[PDB]
């Protein structure tokens, strides 16, 4: 009901960069497993001060996992007030 599966990607973003395609599910972030968006949040605050962060995905429509790496040296959002989720550019879905 709740899997981490990607909505939207904002162009340019670090997702973008990536090339993490709409209905991809992420399924671990540096190798924790995240059953929910907010598992993936969880994962990525632990990465702010990170210069990157390795993502595990499923592509829509294959069991087939991968990692992408993400680039986080121009990451920049306020954990407080914002989504980490978006500011990689990403908009969970639905």
């Given amino acids: ?3 981490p599966v990607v909505g939207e990607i ?4 670090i997702a973008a960069e990536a090339q993490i395609a709409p209905g991809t599910e992420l399924k671990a972030v540096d190798g ?8 993936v949040r969880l994962q990525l605050v632990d990465k702010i001060g990170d ?3 390795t993502i ?4 829509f429509g294959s ?3 991968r990692d992408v790496k993400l680039d986080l040296r121009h990451w ?7 989504d980490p989720v ?7 879905r639905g």
């Fill in 56 to 59: 595990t995905v499923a592509p």
């Fill in 51 to 53: 210069e990157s962060t």
């Fill in 76 to 82: 920049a959002f306020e954990p407080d007030k914002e």
């Fill in 32 to 39: 924790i497993e995240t059953p929910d968006w907010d598992a």
């Fill in 86 to 92: 978006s500011s990689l550019g990403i908009r969970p």
């Fill in 63 to 65: 069991d087939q996992r």
């Fill in 1 to 3: 009901m709740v899997r």
């Fill in 10 to 13: 904002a162009a340019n973003s």
